[PDB]
CSV table of C-alpha atoms and ligand atoms in Angstrom, one decimal:
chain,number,residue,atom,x,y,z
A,1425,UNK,CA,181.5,30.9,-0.9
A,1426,UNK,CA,184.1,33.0,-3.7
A,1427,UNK,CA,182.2,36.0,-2.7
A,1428,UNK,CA,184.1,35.5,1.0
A,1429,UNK,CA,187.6,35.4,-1.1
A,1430,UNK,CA,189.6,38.1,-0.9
A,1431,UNK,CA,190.1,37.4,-4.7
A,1432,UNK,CA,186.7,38.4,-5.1
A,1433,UNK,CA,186.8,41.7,-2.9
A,1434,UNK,CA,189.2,43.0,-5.1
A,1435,UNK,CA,187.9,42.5,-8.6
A,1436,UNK,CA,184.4,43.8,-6.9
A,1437,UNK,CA,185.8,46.7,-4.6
A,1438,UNK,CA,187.7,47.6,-8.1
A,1439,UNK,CA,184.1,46.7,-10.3
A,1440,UNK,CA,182.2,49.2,-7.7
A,1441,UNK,CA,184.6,51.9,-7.3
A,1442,UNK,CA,187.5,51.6,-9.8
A,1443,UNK,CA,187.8,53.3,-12.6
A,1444,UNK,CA,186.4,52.3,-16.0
A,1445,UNK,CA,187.5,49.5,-18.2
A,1446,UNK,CA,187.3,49.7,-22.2
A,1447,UNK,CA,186.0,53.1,-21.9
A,1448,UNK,CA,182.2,50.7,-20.3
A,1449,UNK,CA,181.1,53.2,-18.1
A,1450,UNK,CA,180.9,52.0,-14.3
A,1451,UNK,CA,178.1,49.1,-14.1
A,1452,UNK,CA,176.1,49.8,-11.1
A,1453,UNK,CA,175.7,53.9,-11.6
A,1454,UNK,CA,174.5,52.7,-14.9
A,1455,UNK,CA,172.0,50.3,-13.5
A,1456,UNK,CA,170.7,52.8,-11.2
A,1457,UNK,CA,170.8,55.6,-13.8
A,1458,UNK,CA,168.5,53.7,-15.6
A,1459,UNK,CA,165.9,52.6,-12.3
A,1460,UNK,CA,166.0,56.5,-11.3
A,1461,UNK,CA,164.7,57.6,-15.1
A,1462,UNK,CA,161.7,55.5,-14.8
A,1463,UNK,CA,161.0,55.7,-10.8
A,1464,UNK,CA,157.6,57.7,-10.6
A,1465,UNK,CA,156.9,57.0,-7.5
A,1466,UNK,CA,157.6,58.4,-3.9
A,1467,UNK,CA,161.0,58.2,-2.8
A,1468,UNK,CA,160.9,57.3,0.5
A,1469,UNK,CA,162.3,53.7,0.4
A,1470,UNK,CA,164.4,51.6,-1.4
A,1471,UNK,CA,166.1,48.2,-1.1
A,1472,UNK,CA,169.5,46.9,-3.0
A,1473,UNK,CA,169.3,42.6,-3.0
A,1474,UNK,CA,173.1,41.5,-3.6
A,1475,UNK,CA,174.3,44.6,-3.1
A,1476,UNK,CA,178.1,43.6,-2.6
A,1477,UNK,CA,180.4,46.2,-1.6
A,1478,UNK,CA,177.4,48.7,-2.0
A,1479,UNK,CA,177.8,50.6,-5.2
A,1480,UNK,CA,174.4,51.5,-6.4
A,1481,UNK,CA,172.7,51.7,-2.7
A,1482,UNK,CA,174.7,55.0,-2.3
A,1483,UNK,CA,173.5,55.8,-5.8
A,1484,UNK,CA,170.2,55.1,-4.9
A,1485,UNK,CA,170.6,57.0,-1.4
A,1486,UNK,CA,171.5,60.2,-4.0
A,1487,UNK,CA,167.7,60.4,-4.3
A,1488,UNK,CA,166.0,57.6,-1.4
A,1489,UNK,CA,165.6,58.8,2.2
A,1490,UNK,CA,166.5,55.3,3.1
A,1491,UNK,CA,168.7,52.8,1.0
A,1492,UNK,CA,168.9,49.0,2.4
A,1493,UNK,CA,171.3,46.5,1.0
A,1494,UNK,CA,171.4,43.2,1.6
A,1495,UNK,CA,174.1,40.2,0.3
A,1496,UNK,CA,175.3,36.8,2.0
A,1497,UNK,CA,178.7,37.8,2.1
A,1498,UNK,CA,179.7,39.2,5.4
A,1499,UNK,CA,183.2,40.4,3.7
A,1500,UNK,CA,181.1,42.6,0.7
A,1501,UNK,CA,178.9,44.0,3.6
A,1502,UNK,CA,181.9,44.8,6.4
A,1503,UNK,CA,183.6,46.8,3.0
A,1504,UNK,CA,180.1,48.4,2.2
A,1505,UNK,CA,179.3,49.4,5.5
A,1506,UNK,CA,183.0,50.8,6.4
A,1507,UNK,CA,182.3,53.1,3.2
A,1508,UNK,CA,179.2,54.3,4.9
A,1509,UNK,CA,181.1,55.0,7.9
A,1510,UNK,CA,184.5,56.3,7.2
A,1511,UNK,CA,183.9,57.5,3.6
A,1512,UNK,CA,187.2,55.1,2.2
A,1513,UNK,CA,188.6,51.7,2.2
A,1514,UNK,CA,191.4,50.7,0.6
A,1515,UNK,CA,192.2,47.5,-1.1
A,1516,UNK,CA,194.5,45.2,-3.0
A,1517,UNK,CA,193.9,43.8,-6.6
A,1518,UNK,CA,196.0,41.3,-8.8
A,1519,UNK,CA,198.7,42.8,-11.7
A,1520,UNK,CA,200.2,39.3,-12.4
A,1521,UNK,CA,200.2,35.9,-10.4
A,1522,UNK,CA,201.5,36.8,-7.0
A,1523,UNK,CA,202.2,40.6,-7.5
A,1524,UNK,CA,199.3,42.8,-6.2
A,1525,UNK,CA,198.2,46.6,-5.9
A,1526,UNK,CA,197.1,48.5,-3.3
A,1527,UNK,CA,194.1,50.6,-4.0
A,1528,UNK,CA,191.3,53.2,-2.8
A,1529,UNK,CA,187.8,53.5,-2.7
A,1530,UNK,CA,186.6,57.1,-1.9
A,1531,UNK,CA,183.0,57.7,-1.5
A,1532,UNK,CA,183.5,61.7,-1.6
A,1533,UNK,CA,185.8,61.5,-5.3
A,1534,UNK,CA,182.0,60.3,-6.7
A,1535,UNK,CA,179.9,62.4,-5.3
A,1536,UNK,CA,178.3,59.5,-2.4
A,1537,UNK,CA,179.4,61.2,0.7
A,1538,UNK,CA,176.9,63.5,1.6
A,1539,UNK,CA,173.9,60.9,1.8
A,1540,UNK,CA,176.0,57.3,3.0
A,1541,UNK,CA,174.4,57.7,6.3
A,1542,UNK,CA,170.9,56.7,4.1
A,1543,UNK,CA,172.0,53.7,3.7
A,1544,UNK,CA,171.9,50.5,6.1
A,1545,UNK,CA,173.7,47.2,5.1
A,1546,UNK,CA,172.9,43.8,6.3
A,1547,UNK,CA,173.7,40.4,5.9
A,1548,UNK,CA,170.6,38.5,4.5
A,1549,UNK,CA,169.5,35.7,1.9
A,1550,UNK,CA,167.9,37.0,-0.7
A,1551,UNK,CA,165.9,33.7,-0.7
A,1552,UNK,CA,164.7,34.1,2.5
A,1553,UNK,CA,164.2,37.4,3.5
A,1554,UNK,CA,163.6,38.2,7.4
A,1555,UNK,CA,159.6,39.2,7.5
A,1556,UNK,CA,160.0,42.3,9.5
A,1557,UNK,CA,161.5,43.8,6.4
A,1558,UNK,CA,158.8,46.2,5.5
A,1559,UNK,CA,158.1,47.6,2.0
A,1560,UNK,CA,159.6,49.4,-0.6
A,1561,UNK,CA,159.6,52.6,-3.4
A,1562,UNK,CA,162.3,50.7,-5.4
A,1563,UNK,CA,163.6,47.1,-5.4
A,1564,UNK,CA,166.7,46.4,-7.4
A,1565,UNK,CA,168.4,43.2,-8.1
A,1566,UNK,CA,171.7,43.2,-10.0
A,1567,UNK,CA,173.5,40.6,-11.7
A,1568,UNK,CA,171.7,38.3,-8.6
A,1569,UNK,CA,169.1,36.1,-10.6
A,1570,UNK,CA,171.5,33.7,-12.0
A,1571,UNK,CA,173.8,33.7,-8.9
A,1572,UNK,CA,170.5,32.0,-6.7
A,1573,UNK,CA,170.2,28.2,-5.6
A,1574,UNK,CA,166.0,29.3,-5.9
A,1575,UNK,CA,165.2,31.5,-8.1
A,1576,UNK,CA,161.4,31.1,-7.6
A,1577,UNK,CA,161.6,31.3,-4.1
A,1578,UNK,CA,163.2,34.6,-4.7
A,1579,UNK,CA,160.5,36.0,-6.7
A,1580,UNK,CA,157.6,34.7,-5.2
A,1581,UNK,CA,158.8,37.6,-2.6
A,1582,UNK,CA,158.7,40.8,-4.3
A,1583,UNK,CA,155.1,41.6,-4.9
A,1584,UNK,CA,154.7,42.0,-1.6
A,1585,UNK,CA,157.9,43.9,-1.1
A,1586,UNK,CA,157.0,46.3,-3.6
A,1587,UNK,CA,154.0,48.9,-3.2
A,1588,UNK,CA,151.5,49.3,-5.9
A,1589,UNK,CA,153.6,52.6,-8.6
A,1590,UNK,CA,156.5,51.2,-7.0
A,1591,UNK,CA,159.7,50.2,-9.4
A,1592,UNK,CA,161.4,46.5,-9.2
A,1593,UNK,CA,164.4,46.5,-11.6
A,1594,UNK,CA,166.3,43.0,-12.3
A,1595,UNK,CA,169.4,42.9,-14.5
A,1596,UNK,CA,171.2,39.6,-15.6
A,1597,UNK,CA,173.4,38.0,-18.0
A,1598,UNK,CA,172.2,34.8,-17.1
A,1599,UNK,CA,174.8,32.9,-16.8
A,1600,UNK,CA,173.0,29.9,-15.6
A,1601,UNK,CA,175.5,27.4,-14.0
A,1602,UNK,CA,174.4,24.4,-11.3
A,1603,UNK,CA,177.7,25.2,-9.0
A,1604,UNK,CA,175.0,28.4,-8.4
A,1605,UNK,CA,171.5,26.9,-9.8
A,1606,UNK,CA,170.4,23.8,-9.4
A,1607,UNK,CA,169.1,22.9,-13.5
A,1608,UNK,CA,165.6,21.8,-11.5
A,1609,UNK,CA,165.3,25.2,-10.1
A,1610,UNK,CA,166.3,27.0,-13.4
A,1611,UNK,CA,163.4,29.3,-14.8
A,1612,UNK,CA,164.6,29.7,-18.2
A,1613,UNK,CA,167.4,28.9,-20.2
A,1614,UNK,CA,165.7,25.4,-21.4
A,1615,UNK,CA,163.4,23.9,-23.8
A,1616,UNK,CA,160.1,22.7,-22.8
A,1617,UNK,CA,157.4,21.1,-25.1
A,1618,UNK,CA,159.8,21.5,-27.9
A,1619,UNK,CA,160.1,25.4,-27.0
A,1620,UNK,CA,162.5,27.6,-26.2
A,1621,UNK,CA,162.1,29.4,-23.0
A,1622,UNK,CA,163.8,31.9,-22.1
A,1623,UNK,CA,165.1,33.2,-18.7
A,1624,UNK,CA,162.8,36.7,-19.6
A,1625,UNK,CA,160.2,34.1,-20.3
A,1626,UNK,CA,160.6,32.4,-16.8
A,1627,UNK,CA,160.6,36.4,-15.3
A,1628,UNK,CA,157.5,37.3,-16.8
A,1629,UNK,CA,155.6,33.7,-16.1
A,1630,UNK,CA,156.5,34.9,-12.0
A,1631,UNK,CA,155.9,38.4,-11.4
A,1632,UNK,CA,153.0,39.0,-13.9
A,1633,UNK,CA,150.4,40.6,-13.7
A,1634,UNK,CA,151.3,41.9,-10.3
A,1635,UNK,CA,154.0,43.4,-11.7
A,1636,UNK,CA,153.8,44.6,-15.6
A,1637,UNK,CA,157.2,44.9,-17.8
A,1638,UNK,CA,158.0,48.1,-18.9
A,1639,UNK,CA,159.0,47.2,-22.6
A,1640,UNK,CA,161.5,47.0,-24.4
A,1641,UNK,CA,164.5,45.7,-21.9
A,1642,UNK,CA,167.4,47.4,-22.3
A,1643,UNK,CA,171.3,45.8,-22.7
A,1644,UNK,CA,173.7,47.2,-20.1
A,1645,UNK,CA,177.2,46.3,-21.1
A,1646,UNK,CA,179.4,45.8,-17.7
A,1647,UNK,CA,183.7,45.1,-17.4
A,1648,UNK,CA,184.9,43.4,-14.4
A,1649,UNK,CA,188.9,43.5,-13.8
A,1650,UNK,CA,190.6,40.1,-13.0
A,1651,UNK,CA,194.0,40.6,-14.0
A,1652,UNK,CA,195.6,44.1,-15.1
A,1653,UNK,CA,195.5,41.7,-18.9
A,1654,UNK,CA,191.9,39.8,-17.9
A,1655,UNK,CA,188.6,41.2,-17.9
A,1656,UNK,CA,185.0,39.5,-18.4
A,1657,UNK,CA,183.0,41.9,-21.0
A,1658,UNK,CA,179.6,40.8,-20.4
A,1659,UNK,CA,176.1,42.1,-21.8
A,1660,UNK,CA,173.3,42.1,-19.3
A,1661,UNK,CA,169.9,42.2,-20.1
A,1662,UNK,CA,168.0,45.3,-17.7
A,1663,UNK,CA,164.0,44.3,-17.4
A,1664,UNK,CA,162.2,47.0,-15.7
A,1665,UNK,CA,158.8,46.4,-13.6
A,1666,UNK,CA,155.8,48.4,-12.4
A,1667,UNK,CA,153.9,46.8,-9.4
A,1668,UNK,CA,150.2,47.4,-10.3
B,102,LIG,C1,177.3,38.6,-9.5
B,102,LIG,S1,177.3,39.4,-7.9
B,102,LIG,C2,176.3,40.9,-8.2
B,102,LIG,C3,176.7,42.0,-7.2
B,102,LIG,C4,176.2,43.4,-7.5
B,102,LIG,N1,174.7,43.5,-7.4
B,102,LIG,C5,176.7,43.9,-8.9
B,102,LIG,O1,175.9,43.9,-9.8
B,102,LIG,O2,177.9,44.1,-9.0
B,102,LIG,C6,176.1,38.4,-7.0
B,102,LIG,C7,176.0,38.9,-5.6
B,102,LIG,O3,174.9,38.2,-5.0
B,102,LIG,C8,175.3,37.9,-3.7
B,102,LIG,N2,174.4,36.7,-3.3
B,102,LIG,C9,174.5,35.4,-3.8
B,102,LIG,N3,173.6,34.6,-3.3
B,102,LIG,C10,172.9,35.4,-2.4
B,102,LIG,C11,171.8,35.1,-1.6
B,102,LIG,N4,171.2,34.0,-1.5
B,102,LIG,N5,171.3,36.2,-0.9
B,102,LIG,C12,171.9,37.4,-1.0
B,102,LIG,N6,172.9,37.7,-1.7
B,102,LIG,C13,173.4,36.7,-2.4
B,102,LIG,C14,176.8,37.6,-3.8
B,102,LIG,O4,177.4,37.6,-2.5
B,102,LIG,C15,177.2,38.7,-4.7
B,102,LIG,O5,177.5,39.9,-4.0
């Protein structure tokens, strides 16, 4: 698993809590920006599926009297929950080859202090959630769809994790790749009877009608830091969904 790496903590602890790249403002207070203008429903739950080091569960906890996040890596949700708990961690990324950077998170420099103890992280599968889970206000999913092994399996969850006025929010650039989806298990990105269909398409076909797309999606642009020289400057696509 790279999300174990310590490669990967970096480039994510710096994606979640680093400071901007490209003048692209920080991707998962963006996404949540975005979930929070369109919530109208109570606010008394909410749950964050591939949460990694827990950037937008503290953003959600700004406004939710309980925040869960849930990833597979055990590495994201020990940094996540160590925010929670001691308000910092500290980190190193990569400047060139071998020579590193140390670096600091800080919970209280954006304004997530005061509501961390909202939130709750756990280690989960996404694609097989534990049943005593409950339901939610808000369900969001970032940059998670194309990172599954099952996809449909995934979905075929959330209408009964969301309650009726509640808010599912799924962003993606869909990078579809079989190291992460098996091309059997893909729900878009293919041709079929000669016609294109599209990983929106594949969205839609699953979660209506329980759930109904708020048109138009929205593109969220997002900067992740690999090097101090390379970064991936990648367009997501944001779909936002009403449970009926
Ligand atoms: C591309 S990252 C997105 C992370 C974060 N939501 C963001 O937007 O920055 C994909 C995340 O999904 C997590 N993940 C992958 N497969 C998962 C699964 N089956 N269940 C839960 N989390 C999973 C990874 O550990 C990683 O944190």
């Amino acid at each position: 698993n790279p999300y174990e790496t310590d490669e990967l903590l970096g480039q994510y602890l710096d994606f979640h809590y680093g400071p901007g790249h490209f003048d692209v403002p920080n991707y998962p207070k963006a996404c949540i920006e975005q979930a929070l203008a369109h919530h109208t429903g109570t606010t008394g739950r909410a749950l964050d599926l591939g949460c990694a080091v827990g950037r937008s569960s503290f953003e959600l906890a700004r406004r939710f009297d309980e925040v869960i996040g849930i990833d597979l890596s055990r590495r994201f949700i020990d940094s996540a929950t160590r925010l929670a708990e001691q308000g910092q961690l500290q980190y190193q990324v990569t400047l060139e080859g071998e020579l590193i950077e140390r670096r600091t998170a800080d919970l209280a420099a954006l304004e997530l202090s005061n509501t961390a103890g909202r939130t709750r992280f756990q280690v989960g599968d996404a694609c097989a959630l534990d049943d005593t889970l409950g339901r939610f206000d808000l369900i969001f999913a970032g940059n998670l769809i194309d990172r599954l092994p099952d996809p449909a399996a995934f979905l075929a969850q959330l209408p009964a994790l969301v309650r009726p006025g509640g808010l599912l929010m799924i962003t993606s650039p869909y990078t579809l790749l079989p190291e992460f989806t098996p091309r059997e298990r893909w729900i878009g990105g293919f041709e079929r009877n000669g016609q294109p269909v599209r990983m929106l398409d594949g969205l839609r076909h699953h979660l209506e009608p329980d759930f109904v797309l708020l048109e138009p999606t929205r593109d969220i642009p997002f900067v992740i830091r690999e090097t101090t020289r390379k970064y991936q400057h990648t367009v997501a696509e944001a779909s936002l969904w009403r449970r009926a």
